[PDB]
Design a binder for these strands. Structure first.
Ligand code: 1FZ
Ligand code: MG
Ligand code: MG
Ligand code: NA
Ligand code: NA
Length: 324
DNA sequence: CCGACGTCGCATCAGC
DNA sequence: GCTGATGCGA
DNA sequence: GTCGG
């Protein structure tokens, strides 16, 4: 459970400062990877040396663990926690649309809190204003029961627009999780293929707006929608606003997309690793046979999830068991 | 020693 | 005004 | 920061 919580909390804090303040994205992923492998380690760690055996834990982190075990803290982490500039930069990045660079410029000109952002609207782009407005809501998870109600609305409205649409809610929801961070909707239509309107996505977004399910828009192109939605108010407390993505994908790429965006991260590259072990390369869009040469062949037809499993020596697995 | 470390759509900026 | 670069999220 | 060619 929280067997090494102090250690993994420490490493996660370190990770965020690397990304958000130091702008060192690879150190960010290094720390997270370290925190991940430790989180799954089934023993209360006794030394940095014990930890270093794990893939992703090196000399520096082994050292930091030693300091944490001896003193209950890290001098460097304590110090940066207390730094007004650095802690403010790291905090502002919690607002969707504010990345490390925007957070930096804000703190440079004295803008450090949500309140400061509130009285400085004209310095905010469209995404950032939405991120600010739903700061709290965007940090809540979504009970699976609300996700089902959300799914009810999306499948109904999609079919209403055109009964030949195919939509699938992917991500942690499809894997059967008890809660979700967002709603990932994948969309296709038999008239849409790789060698094939901009309206296929627009019409679906517009209908979800008409019935007031979709409430705001972060981005909307011809293939990808990123926005905000909310279940109707049950004389009751209103539901939090939620993040929803809608992806339009060609029919011949749809099920690679569904497999991909169902995950999990770790599960899927085990699956990709195993796939190439046999001369097939899997990506988001396609699956493709390698030659003796290493040259990829032309992409192969896929018409179900299970299809890809059959191309590559694997019995189809339920979404329910796809953590790894 | 020292380069890789994931990738890509969309919004918006920077250069011309 | 057009094209490529950058910031961002996931 | 860690790994590995
Ligand atoms: C965006 C993205 C997603 N994925 C897979 C893994 C995730 O399980 C799945 C959906 O992405 P997610 O919404 O970022 N994470 P999640 O849906 O699994 O969990 P959550 O409840 O949204 O937090 O897509 C990748 O493997 N590479 C990616 O770049
Ligand atoms: Mg998700
Ligand atoms: Mg997502
Ligand atoms: Na090691
Ligand atoms: Na942010």
């Amino acid at each position: 459970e929280t067997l090494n919580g102090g250690i993994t909390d420490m490493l996660t804090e370190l990770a965020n400062f690397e990304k958000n303040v130091s702008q060192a994205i690879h150190k960010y992923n290094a720390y997270r990877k370290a925190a991940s492998v430790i989180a799954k380690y089934p023993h209360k760690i006794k030394s940095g040396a014990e930890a270093k055996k794990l893939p992703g834990v090196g000399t520096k982190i082994a050292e930091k663990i030693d300091e944490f075990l001896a003193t209950g803290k890290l001098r460097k982490l304590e110090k940066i926690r207390q730094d007004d500039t650095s802690s403010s930069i790291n905090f502002l990045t919690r607002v969707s649309g504010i990345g490390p660079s925007a957070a930096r410029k804000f703190v440079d000109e004295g803008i450090k809190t949500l309140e400061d952002l509130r009285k400085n609207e004209d310095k905010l782009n469209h995404h950032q204003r939405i991120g600010l407005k739903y700061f709290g809501d965007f940090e809540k998870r979504i009970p699976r029961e609300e996700m089902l109600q959300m799914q009810d609305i999306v499948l109904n409205e999609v079919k209403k627009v055109d009964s030949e649409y195919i939509a699938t809610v992917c991500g942690s929801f499809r894997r059967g999780a008890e809660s979700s961070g967002d709603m990932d909707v994948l969309l296709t239509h038999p008239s849409f293929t790789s060698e094939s309107q901009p309206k296929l996505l627009h019409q679906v977004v517009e209908q979800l707006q008409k019935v007031h399910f979709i409430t705001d828009t972060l981005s909307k192109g011809e293939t990808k929608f990123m926005g905000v939605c909310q279940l109707p108010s049950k004389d009751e407390k209103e539901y939090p606003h939620r993040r929803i993505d809608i992806r339009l994908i060609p029919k011949d790429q749809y099920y690679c997309g569904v497999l991909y965006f169902t995950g999990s991260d770790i599960f899927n590259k085990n699956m990709r690793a195993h796939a190439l072990e046999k001369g097939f390369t899997i990506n988001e869009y396609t699956i493709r046979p390698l030659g003796v040469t290493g040259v990829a062949g032309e992409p192969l037809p896929v018409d179900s999830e299970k299809d890809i499993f059959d191309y590559i020596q694997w019995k189809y697995r339920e979404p329910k068991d796809r953590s790894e």
